[PDB]
């Protein structure tokens, strides 16, 4: 019955910074069964904190929790690039609930990424299906632009991408854009370029393959 | 140090009833109440019951009337039923241990029912379409092993359902500068995904590197060899 509330959505914010979280109940909560738990990136939620103040072992000093009856607060005084995760909050005072979680980013230095480019393997056209991937390697921020050529014609709407989560340790995402075309079409053309174009970069680059060379 | 091990169906065709079970290891059962906590694709958690060693189980409004909890005492396993399945229900469940048996003084109740620790998970998904195995390509690495500089090599895990794949690098061997990028759900229904690795270009042709892909749900097991193109 009880609708917890987290805000903001999304906070970015640079390490050696103040984070500060807030959790809003539609009803007072009792005796102080809040908690708070950490999500990272491909992992289980951990509980963080419990009894709204009292600091499950292994955490460190620098998360705090405050508030009481339908304002709390979760306070990271430090950040570091490992505290990149998404945080949720729960309270058990009724059937437990839990809020829609605010998840929080590391800033960094602007890092250009590392275009590669990977032609289909001669396996897989064997099956009828010609897959190109391109991979942006290490970047921030996590913003970036990704265009297919075949013989200097924009593709749309054969492609995908997937981006990986922010790296605990320098903080920095990946991406890998997949080109999707028959082996006819495939075998029709000869220039498959990937552009790229990102903050950290002055001019787009682009990495780009001769069919069968 | 609390172990917590679960199992179960996950994949299942709709109106269908899911089915896990979790296992505790280390612990008493009488101690602690023990809970069932789903996490939706991209979202949040959601609460769906716990249960006693007393047959004494409590469920979430929402769902109270398609769920049944129950604990097996003797093998120290609590299970979880969801009737009448649907593609909504799909999530990663989770074992957890809930609020702590406290005598004094007395309640003779479980007082903090926050869960730590965790179970490992497992995704269920709910569809019609049937399981397949991946197929394993080598996404080669163009740079000359002389260039000096790092190189990208890495394989292409395509057409399979449903998740998850595992990818690893010589058999574990290989651990920095690894990207496995989350899968994507193509227009065929098939689920793809790539994993990528940067390397010293000095080594392309003196340490082999070999993915190994892993698909439970179809017993799928590869090994696949990336060698630079000749
Ligand atoms: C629990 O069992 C684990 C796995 O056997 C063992 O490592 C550990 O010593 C036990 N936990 C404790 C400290 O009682």
């Known amino acids: 019955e009880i609708v917890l509330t987290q805000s903001p959505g999304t906070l970015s914010l640079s390490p050696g910074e103040r984070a500060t979280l807030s959790c809003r109940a539609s009803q007072s909560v009792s005796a102080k069964n809040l908690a708070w738990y950490q999500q990272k990136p491909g992992q289980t939620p951990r509980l963080l904190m419990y009894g709204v103040s009292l600091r499950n072992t292994g955490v460190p000093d620098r998360f705090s929790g405050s508030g009481s009856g339908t304002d709390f607060t979760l306070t990271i005084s430090r950040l570091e690039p490992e505290d990149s995760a998404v945080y949720f909050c729960?309270?058990?005072?009724?059937?437990?609930?839990f809020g829609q979680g605010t998840k929080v980013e590391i800033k960094r230095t602007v890092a250009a990424p590392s275009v590669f480019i990977f032609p289909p393997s001669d396996e897989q056209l064997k099956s009828g299906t010609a897959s190109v991937v391109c991979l942006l390697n290490n970047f921030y921020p996590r913003e970036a632009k990704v265009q297919w050529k075949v013989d200097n014609a924009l593709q749309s709407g054969n492609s995908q991408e997937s981006v990986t989560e922010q790296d605990s340790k320098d903080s920095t995402y990946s991406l890998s854009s997949t080109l999707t075309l028959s082996k006819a079409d495939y075998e029709k053309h000869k220039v498959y370029a990937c552009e790229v174009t990102h903050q950290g970069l002055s001019s787009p680059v682009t990495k780009s393959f001769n069919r069968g060379e | 140090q609390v172990q917590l091990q679960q199992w179960g169906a996950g994949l299942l065709k709709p109106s269908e009833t899911l089915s896990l079970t979790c296992a505790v290891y280390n612990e008493s059962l009488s101690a602690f109440s023990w809970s069932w906590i789903r996490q939706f694709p991209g979202q949040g958690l959601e609460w769906i019951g716990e249960?006693?060693?007393?047959?004494?189980?409590n469920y979430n409004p929402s769902l109270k009337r398609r769920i049944n909890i129950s604990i097996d005492t003797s093998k120290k396993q609590f299970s979880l039923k969801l009737y009448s399945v649907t593609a909504a229900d799909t999530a990663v469940y989770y074992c957890?241990?809930?609020?702590?048996?406290?005598?004094?003084?007395?309640?003779?109740?479980?007082?903090?029912?926050?869960?730590?620790?965790w179970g490992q998970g497992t995704l269920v998904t709910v569809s019609s379409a049937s399981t397949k195995g991946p197929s394993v390509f080598p996404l080669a690495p163009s740079s000359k092993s002389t260039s000096g500089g790092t190189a990208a090599l890495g394989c292409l895990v395509k057409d399979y359902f449903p998740e998850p794949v595992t990818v690893s690098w010589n058999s574990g061997a290989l651990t920095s500068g690894v990207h496995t990028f989350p899968a994507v759900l193509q227009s065929s229904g098939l689920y793809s995904l790539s994993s990528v690795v940067t390397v010293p270009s000095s080594s392309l042709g003196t340490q082999t590197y070999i993915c190994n892909v892993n698909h439970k749900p179809s017993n799928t097991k590869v090994d696949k060899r990336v060698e630079p193109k000749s």
């Open positions: 957890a241990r809930g609020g702590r048996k406290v005598y004094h003084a007395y309640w003779s109740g479980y007082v903090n029912n926050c869960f730590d620790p």
């Open positions: 729960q309270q058990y005072g009724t059937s437990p609930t």
């Open positions: 249960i006693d060693h007393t047959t004494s189980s």
